């Protein structure tokens, strides 16, 4: 049981699929002249 | 952290063997999740974090209580924190960008002052 | 200890490039006035050309496998 609790808190080999990660900072579009589904989501006033 | 601090405090410098093999296990444990942004998510981000505080803690810890020894696997624990920076970088808006390479640098620092201690 | 021996010997340095670059001994012959054991010169040749003397994967075993593992004037000495 201690040693599961720990695997649970401190998985090792569980989590890391392939470290490839991008890195770059993810960019949002605001702009108001295209209508789609997630931008209606973000943005109300239509 | 605060128990294992607290213990490796109580036990300083005067050795024993039950310790020095539950820290051993704990940062055999804790070493492979150390500085791993696999998915960058701020929730995940900010346990990492204190993973690498935990781990820095332990390293810490294990050398307060095996202090003037001059064993080897805590020897090879402490060289392994130390080399390898890890990180996004490598394998495992100007103000903005100085300000993205300022943590990532001053996380390096941090890590660094524990591993030389 | 030795060198100054050497440097008391007068022939030793034309003859010991001529050994550095295997010159043959008609060469060697021609401006040379004392014999040379021809015995000795492929012998010392000999000893001069004597030469006996899956990424993120294996980063994660390597990086544990390889600083885990604890494996317990001048240079001048090449």
Redesign the interface.
């Known amino acids: 049981g201690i040693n599961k609790v720990?695997?649970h808190l401190?998985?090792?080999?569980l989590?890391?699929?392939?470290?490839?990660?991008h890195?770059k900072?993810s960019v949002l579009v605001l702009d108001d002249r295209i209508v789609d589904a997630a931008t209606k989501d973000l943005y109300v006033n239509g | 952290a605060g128990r294992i601090l607290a213990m490796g405090i109580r036990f300083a410098s005067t050795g024993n063997l039950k310790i020095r093999n539950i820290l051993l296990s704990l940062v055999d444990k804790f070493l492979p999740l150390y500085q791993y942004p696999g998915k960058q998510n701020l929730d995940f981000r900010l346990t990492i974090s204190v993973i690498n505080v935990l781990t820095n803690v332990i390293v810490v810890s294990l050398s307060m209580v095996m202090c003037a020894s001059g064993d080897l696997e805590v020897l090879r624990r402490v060289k392994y924190l130390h080399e390898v920076a890890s990180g996004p970088y490598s394998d495992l808006s100007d103000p903005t960008a100085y300000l993205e390479d300022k943590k990532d640098i001053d996380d390096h620092y941090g890590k660094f002052i524990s591993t030389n201690l | 200890f030795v060198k100054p021996y050497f440097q008391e010997r007068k022939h030793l340095v034309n003859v010991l490039l001529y050994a550095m670059l295997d010159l043959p001994e008609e060469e060697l012959k021609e401006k040379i006035n004392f014999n040379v054991d021809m015995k000795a010169l492929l012998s010392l040749v000999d000893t001069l050309h004597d030469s006996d003397i899956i990424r993120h994967a294996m980063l994660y075993e390597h990086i544990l496998n390889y600083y885990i593992a604890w494996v317990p004037k001048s240079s001048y000495i090449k």
């Open positions: 720990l695997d401190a998985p090792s080999e989590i890391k699929p392939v470290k490839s990660c890195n900072p």
